Design a protein around this nucleic acid. Structure first.
Ligand SMILES: Nc1ncnc2c1ncn2[C@H]1C[C@H](O)[C@@H](COP(=O)(O)OP(=O)(O)OP(=O)(O)O)O1
Ligand SMILES: *P(=O)(O)OC[C@@H]1CC[C@H](n2cc(C)c(=O)[nH]c2=O)O1
Ligand SMILES: [Mg+2]
Length: 1010
DNA sequence: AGTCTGCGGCGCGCGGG
DNA sequence: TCACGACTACCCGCGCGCCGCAGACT
DNA sequence: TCGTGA
């Protein structure tokens, strides 16, 4: 009949028989069972205390379908052989690189194209360099055009120079450098090589390239570290640098080297700093002004100097790479990292030109037109106050008008005659003079966020006028009789210095002071000062009666400067993007499919953008790019927020994408559950695996429904709790989420939640400090135990830590939390690398037409033709199940839950938007977009023509030749340090919920020790 | 020699991911 | 009685206020 | 870099 589900002692389902056999082979161990009775008693006690024992779980029919066979007995061997197969030729080329350098030609010849210089022979004109490894550099004349001007390259036996046709003659500046990328496999090394890659001619194809661009910066980022932390690690480097610069003489003993030894090891990212650190070479940068000139005639002179400078940069980059590369190989010895770096290096974005131009024009025009009107409105009222010096009593009476300073500056005479020099304006108000930054300026310069406009439009708080003070930004006067009442309302009293100072301004005019000032609350209640009134998060107080507007214009001035913040932030970066149309280069836009099959129909507009991505830009080996990974999603009231919508696929092609769900939380649950050897051993693991995203019963949704907030807000709350936060901080976030809640209530909720979540703490001389009585106590204790280790490594792949963060380098100013954050975030990077390697191998094996388009952290997208659309999704699911199985096998568990094995939904679309059923309507864009589709696993299986085709035997024959070496997992050497009786006693104390029991257990171990 | 009179780098608020 | 001990993490760029200096007429 | 409890 039908198959029977497999359930462990907790109500958790495992995979079916066929999938178990195909993935894990045959593995069964009764030794886990042998000690499991003790572990199960402790786990049972915890699950009974919190209330999770006996609760219902989701049960689903088993899934079984055939899978491609593995290439090894275990997952580690299979991934090792695949990783070596993907990266073999380039890895051979990168090693055994030349050490000695070829001398330079005495004279360089200016002629268009590629010229080869070999010592002892005449120069030769060549079409391509045609070499396995070169070092490369590009220079551009950026004020005139975006296209390159000259380039040079160094190889093992020759020197090469490329000169543009523009400088030789003519007036057409559009040209690109050819390198024969499509037909020859080669490695190109260079600092910030993403800039250089966008200039190569053969890169503008939809077909996959055969060249690997390697970046020295990312290698320096990953190994030897840098001052990434803005204040903890970077400011220190800056202060020691300015101390070295100022005082030329160096004392024998440094003043603070003992406190912070790590200071010596770290270095800055810019290539000059890397060169002077590693290779002790000084580089001058003076020539960069010559390429700012707007005349091609100046480039004709100083040609020799510019060429020699570029060659010097090439030599410096080569000698820097020679030092960096072996240490990177020593830190990260698994081939999967190298293959993943190669995969992440190459990306492409297709788009259209006229659409881009229309988008830019619309956004800019609306932004300027919105700004001008409100500025004019405010100038018009300032003019009348400017003439109101006469009849001083009128401004004297009004408190806001009284707050204005109406003094005037007298006139100067030199030799009894007026200089009329360095005089702003003669005998005009002093406040009005400040508005003008220069004499020549005719109209006052006034803008939203200026400090004076909350006076120009009168505004009140609790029907009380606002007054500015030196120590406290804004304060409203409150009568004495109600002061305790405002203390009841939790309003904070003003500082004593300001209260003493305000008496003089009150007693002047003969006015009287019958009240004390009360500070206007900043969003943060304690020790924060309010500065600006038109800022966001003041909108809730606005129109509630907490803040009163006598001027309706303020409301308009609030709507403007809130519909146009994003465009103000990003207009520069967006408008400066480099786009290349198809009409300029007709022969280069080539389809992904090998068979063209005609039907081009002379497509009017196409364009390609090459994103400039640094693959490793953080201590946690994450990638950086300034515009696209930091692009905002579409919003109804924000002008120009449809950026990612501009990417479109060419006809006959589509985008297939996926996103990982609850990644870091799942990794944390796994590393917590590793000790028990059973999935769901901890309470937080059971509260992670309780349900699925589709049914709506995930952990984040439950947190959202308990706290009454959105799912994103719950995500912020949970991640902040996990990395380490405070109850006051969490209560503050609850105050942001709902403005109608009294502070004491939020504090009470935060305290009860944290008391249930974390639990109590205990300090003992044998067992150091540990947590007990909490749901996530074991997860924490394991994290601090692994953070303290001498040589920390990533649990999955054994990647080492940077030199700067090592505890030997730091004897003061220790940074414990960064290590905890680093381990998990790095594990996420390892997940991404495994996904990319598996997808590449499957694509190459089954001859699918596919190429990676973009990968924003968890999110991954591909460009796939119409015929192969479902096959890519099938490959994605296979990649996901392999990656999850590898993660479980490394920790010591040989089983996997069924619910978390596969992606929830895989989406097929034509443009880049977050959800397929989104209209994406902005103030600039008034046209709806047709919907795509999203499929789960069953809807993927029942569709026809979604199965893989016939394989190729030669690929397996090539994979089979590589070798495999056994390695012991990282947690085993950690566990062999501790003796088993100490382990059983430590766990037995960690499960107790009362302090007296823990004391008794400690004494019982002391008696057993004898 | 005095007498003011601008001025660009540094740092903090404030938004995007 | 002191010994921790605190504390979301990883990134990007723009606008306004402040200060230690350069520069044009007595 | 001051603050705090068991
Ligand atoms: N406020 C945040 N604080 C710390 N880390 C964050 C934060 N936001 C996002 N991240 C980190 C942790 C996330 O697992 C990871 C990916 O972002 P995100 O997609 O929002 O989480 P997620 O993978 O659980 O989404 P989902 O489950 O809906 O697919 O980056
Ligand atoms: P955006 O699409 O919103 O974010 C994409 C990725 C997800 C993870 C990373 N990230 C985003 C945000 C908003 C954050 O605060 N911290 C992150 O690490 O960027
Ligand atoms: Mg996600």
């Amino acid at each position: 009949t039908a198959e029977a589900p497999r359930i462990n002692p907790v109500g958790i389902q495992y995979l079916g028989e066929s999938l178990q056999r195909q993935v894990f082979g045959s593995c069964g161990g009764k030794d886990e069972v042998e000690q499991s009775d003790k572990l199960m008693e402790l786990s049972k006690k915890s699950l009974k205390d919190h209330g999770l024992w006996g609760k219902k779980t989701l049960i689903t029919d088993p899934i079984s379908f055939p899978l491609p066979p593995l290439q090894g007995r275990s997952l580690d061997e299979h991934f090792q052989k695949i990783g070596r197969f993907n990266s073999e030729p380039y890895k051979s080329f990168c090693e055994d690189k030349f050490t000695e350098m070829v001398a330079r030609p005495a004279e360089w010849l200016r002629k268009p194209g590629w010229v080869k210089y070999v010592p002892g022979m005449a120069p030769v004109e060549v079409a391509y360099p045609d070499e396995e490894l070169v070092v490369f550099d590009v220079e551009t004349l950026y004020n005139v055009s975006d296209y390159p001007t000259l380039a040079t390259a160094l190889s093992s036996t020759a020197w090469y120079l490329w000169c543009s046709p523009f400088i030789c003659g003519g007036d057409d500046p559009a040209a690109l450098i050819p390198l024969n990328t499509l037909n020859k496999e080669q490695v190109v090394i260079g600092h910030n090589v993403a800039y250089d890659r966008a200039r190569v001619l053969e890169e503008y194809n939809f077909r996959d390239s055969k060249a690997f661009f390697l970046d020295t910066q990312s290698l320096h980022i990953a190994s030897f570290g840098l001052c990434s932390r803005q204040r903890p690690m970077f400011m220190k480097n800056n202060k020691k640098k300015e101390a070295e610069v100022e005082s030329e003489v160096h004392p024998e003993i440094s003043i603070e080297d003992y406190d912070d030894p790590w200071l010596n090891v770290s270095a800055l990212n810019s290539l000059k700093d890397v060169a002077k650190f590693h290779c002790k070479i000084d580089l001058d940068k003076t020539d960069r002004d010559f390429f700012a000139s707007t005349d091609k005639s100046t480039i004709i002179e100083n040609f020799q100097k510019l060429v020699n400078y570029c060659a010097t940069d090439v030599t410096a980059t080569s000698q820097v790479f020679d030092k960096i590369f072996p240490v990177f190989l020593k830190k990260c010895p698994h081939p999967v990292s190298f293959a993943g770096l190669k995969s992440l290096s190459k990306c492409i974005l297709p788009t259209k030109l006229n659409d881009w131009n229309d988008y830019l024009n619309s956004s800019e025009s609306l932004y300027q037109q919105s700004k001008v009107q409100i500025e004019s409105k405010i100038v018009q009222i300032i003019k009348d106050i400017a003439l109101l010096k006469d009849k001083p009593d009128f401004y004297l009476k009004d408190p806001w008008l009284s707050q204005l300073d109406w003094t005037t500056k007298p006139l100067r005479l030199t030799k009894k005659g007026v200089p009329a020099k360095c005089q702003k304006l003669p005998g005009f108000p002093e406040w009005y003079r400040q508005l003008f930054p220069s004499k020549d300026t005719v109209e006052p310069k006034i803008t939203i966020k200026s400090r004076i406009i909350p006076i120009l439009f009168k505004l009140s708080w609790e029907n009380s006028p606002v007054i500015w003070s030196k120590e406290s930004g804004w304060c409203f006067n409150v009568p004495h009789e109600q002061v305790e009442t405002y203390k009841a309302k939790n309003y904070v009293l003003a500082d004593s210095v300001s209260q003493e100072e305000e008496e003089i301004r009150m007693n002047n005019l003969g006015l009287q002071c019958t009240g004390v000032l009360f500070k206007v609350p900043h969003p943060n209640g304690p020790t924060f000062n309010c500065t600006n009134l038109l800022t966001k998060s003041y909108n809730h107080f606005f129109e509630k009666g907490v803040l009163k507007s006598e001027s309706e214009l303020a409301h308009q001035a609030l709507q403007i400067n809130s519909s146009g913040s994003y465009w103000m932030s990003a207009r520069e970066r967006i408008q400066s993007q480099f786009v290349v149309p198809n009409c300029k280069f007709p022969n280069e836009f080539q389809s992904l499919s090998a068979k063209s099959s005609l039907n081009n129909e002379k497509t009017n507009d196409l364009a390609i953008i090459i994103p400039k991505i640094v693959p490793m830009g953080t201590i946690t080996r994450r990638a950086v790019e300034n515009t696209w990974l930091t692009a905002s999603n579409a919003k109804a009231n924000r002008i120009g927020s449809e950026l990612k919508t501009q990417v479109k696929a060419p006809p006959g092609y589509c985008f297939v994408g996926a996103d990982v769900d609850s990644e870091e939380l799942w990794i944390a649950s796994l590393v917590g559950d590793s000790i028990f050897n059973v999935h769901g051993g901890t309470a937080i693991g059971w509260m992670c695996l309780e349900g699925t995203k589709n049914e709506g019963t995930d952990l984040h949704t439950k947190t959202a429904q308990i706290l009454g907030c959105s799912r994103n807000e719950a995500k912020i709350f949970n991640y902040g709790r996990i990395y380490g936060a405070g109850a006051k901080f969490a209560s503050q976030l609850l105050k942001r989420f709902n403005p109608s809640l009294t502070d004491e209530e939020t504090k009470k909720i935060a305290n009860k939640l944290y008391e249930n979540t974390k639990g109590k703490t205990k300090r003992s001389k044998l067992f150091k400090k540990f947590w007990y009585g909490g749901s996530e106590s074991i997860l924490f204790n394991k994290l601090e135990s692994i953070a303290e280790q001498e040589t920390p490594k990533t649990p999955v792949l054994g990647c080492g830590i940077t030199y700067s963060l090592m505890k030997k380098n730091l004897r003061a100013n220790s940074f414990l939390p960064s290590r905890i954050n680093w381990a998990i975030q790095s594990s996420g990077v390892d997940y991404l690398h495994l996904l990319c390697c598996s997808m590449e191998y499957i694509i190459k094996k089954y001859n699918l037409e596919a190429r990676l388009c973009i990968s924003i952290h968890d999110e991954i997208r591909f460009l796939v033709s119409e015929k192969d659309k479902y096959r890519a999704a099938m490959a994605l699911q296979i990649s996901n199940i392999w990656t999850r199985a590898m993660f479980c096998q490394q920790m010591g568990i040989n089983e996997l839950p069924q619910n978390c094995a596969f992606f929830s939904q895989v989406d097929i679309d034509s443009v880049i938007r977050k959800e397929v059923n989104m209209d994406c309507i902005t103030p600039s864009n008034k046209t709806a977009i047709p919907h795509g589709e999203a499929l789960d696993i069953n809807q993927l299986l029942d569709k026809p023509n979604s199965k893989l085709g016939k394989p190729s035997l030669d690929i397996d024959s090539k994979v089979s030749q590589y070798a495999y070496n056994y390695r012991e997992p990282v947690f085993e050497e950690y566990n062999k340090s501790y003796t088993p009786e100490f382990l059983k006693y430590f766990l037995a104390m960690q499960v107790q919920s009362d302090k007296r029991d823990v004391n008794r257990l400690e004494d019982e171990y002391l008696r057993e020790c004898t």
